Amino acid sequence: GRTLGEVWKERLNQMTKEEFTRYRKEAIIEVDRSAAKHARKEGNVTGGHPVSRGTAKLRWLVERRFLEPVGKVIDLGCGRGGWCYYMATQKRVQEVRGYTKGGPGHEEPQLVQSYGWNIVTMKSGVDVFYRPSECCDTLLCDIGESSSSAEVEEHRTIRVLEMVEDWLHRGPREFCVKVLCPYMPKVIEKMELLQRRYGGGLVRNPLSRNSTHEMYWVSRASGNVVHSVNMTSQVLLGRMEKRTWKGPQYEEDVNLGSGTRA
Ligand SMILES: Nc1ncnc2c1ncn2[C@@H]1O[C@H](C[C@@H](N)CC[C@H](N)C(=O)O)[C@@H](O)[C@H]1O
């Protein structure tokens, strides 16, 4: 259909099992989680290992200044807690509150003791779509249930964005919101309006797998929404037609350290 994003989606759903798994990691940056996995088994809760691949993703963003976490942090759809625990290590942050659905099929928050864990409070069993908004200085959201249907994803992304705006009008100046399907017309229009009222821009995280078109709307980014999205659709589409396959590119999963913060 229209938009490069839609052709990408069509081509993805047409791949065989083996090519789909090969393609999703091609040329993306991927942190090694071996040590984190063995620490979980041995119960090593103070080794400083992140609880998921999510922290390395948020680190990429914060390290490039796409946002500057500060004050009270609320993390919607915290899952295991990768973003909460990473935010707990930032000096400007003083409180981290995470909410996640939990329950069968969903990740439960993992309680570990990486640096600043005492400032973190995660509550499971909370479907954020029904929870009235709360005040915060930094708002984070990483919700986006994928679907083979681009229309389903468009609807789910709009739902997220309308939910997120309820927390934004409260005052959070700093934010990072995952936009599951940014290429569909309704999300493009919704984002253009959201960008007018709250600034920021769409950024493609190189740690994301090629099997998802997800991009992050962060407060300290800018630029045309259509341009940014199409640019990403092109990179994703180009990775399907390579003749030389190099697989995922290694990067160390940085240690969060341990201890508590005053
Ligand atoms: N309606 C919802 N309300 C609250 N949480 C949700 C909802 N839908 C999905 N989720 C959670 O959102 C999470 C998405 C994850 N990718 C978050 C990972 C997290 N950012 C990390 O770094 O570890 C999942 O754990 C889902 O269970």
In order of their start, the domains of the chain are 1-262 (3.40.50.150)
CA 119-258-63 angle, 5° bins: 75
Catalytic site residue from 142, 154, 174, 253: 142
CA gap 227, 210 in Å, rounded: 19
Pairing label, strands 249-251, 29-31: parallel
Tokens in use for 254?
Answer: 């940085």
CA gap 105, 178 in Å, rounded: 20
Instruction: Evaluate: CB of 50 within 6 angstroms of ligand 1.
Output: no
Gap from CA of 251 to ligand 1 centroid (Å): 24
Instruction: Evaluate: CB of 54 within 6 angstroms of ligand 1.
Output: yes
Gap from CA of 80 to ligand 1 centroid (Å): 8
Gap from CA of 149 to ligand 1 centroid (Å): 20
CA gap 174, 148 in Å, rounded: 32
Asked if 119 and 142 touch (Cβ cutoff 8 Å), the reply is no
Contacts 24+ apart (CB under 8 A), 192-200: 192/225, 194/161, 194/165, 195/225, 198/168, 200/175
Tell me the sheet residues that pair with 71: 93
Q: Is residue 9 flagged as an active site residue?
A: no
Going by CA atoms, what residue is nearest to atom 16 of ligand 1? 142
Pairing label, strands 174-179, 215-218: antiparallel
Specify the resolution in Å: 2.0
Going by CA atoms, what residue is nearest to atom 3 of ligand 1? 127
Tokens in use for 230?
Answer: 């199409």
CA gap 212, 65 in Å, rounded: 23
Provide the residue type at 12 as one letter.
Answer: L
Ramachandran angles phi, psi of 103, nearest 5°: 90, 175
Asked if 83 and 58 touch (Cβ cutoff 8 Å), the reply is yes
Provide the residue type at 127 as one letter.
Answer: D
Q: Does the annotation list 142 as a binding residue?
A: yes
Q: For a pocket test of ligand 1, which of 57, 78, 214 has the largest count of ligand atoms closer than 8 A to its C-beta? A: 78
Output the DSSP codes for 13-63.
TTS-HHHHHHHTTTT-EEE--HHHHHHHHHT--SS---SSTHHHHHHHHHH
Q: Which of 165, 220, 227, 222 is nearest to 190 (CA)?
A: 165
CA gap 80, 21 in Å, rounded: 24
Ramachandran angles phi, psi of 72, nearest 5°: -90, 125
CA torsion sign, 97 to 101 to 103 to 106?
negative
Tokens in use for 153?
Answer: 């994803």
Instruction: Evaluate: CB of 127 within 6 angstroms of ligand 1.
Output: yes
Gap from CA of 242 to ligand 1 centroid (Å): 33
Q: For a pocket test of ligand 1, which of 106, 110, 139 has the largest count of ligand atoms closer than 8 A to its C-beta? A: 106
Instruction: Evaluate: CB of 109 within 6 angstroms of ligand 1.
Output: no
Output the DSSP codes for the chain.
--SHHHHHHHHHTTS-HHHHHHHTTTT-EEE--HHHHHHHHHT--SS---SSTHHHHHHHHHHTTS----EEEEEET-TT-HHHHHHTT-TTEEEEEEE---STTSPPPP---BTTGGGEEEE-S--TTSSPP---SEEEE------S-HHHHHHHHHHHHHHHHHHHTT---EEEEEES-TTSHHHHHHHHHHHHHH--EEE--TTS-TT---EEEETT--S-HHHHHHHHHHHHHHTTS-SS---PEEE------B----
Asked if 58 and 256 touch (Cβ cutoff 8 Å), the reply is no
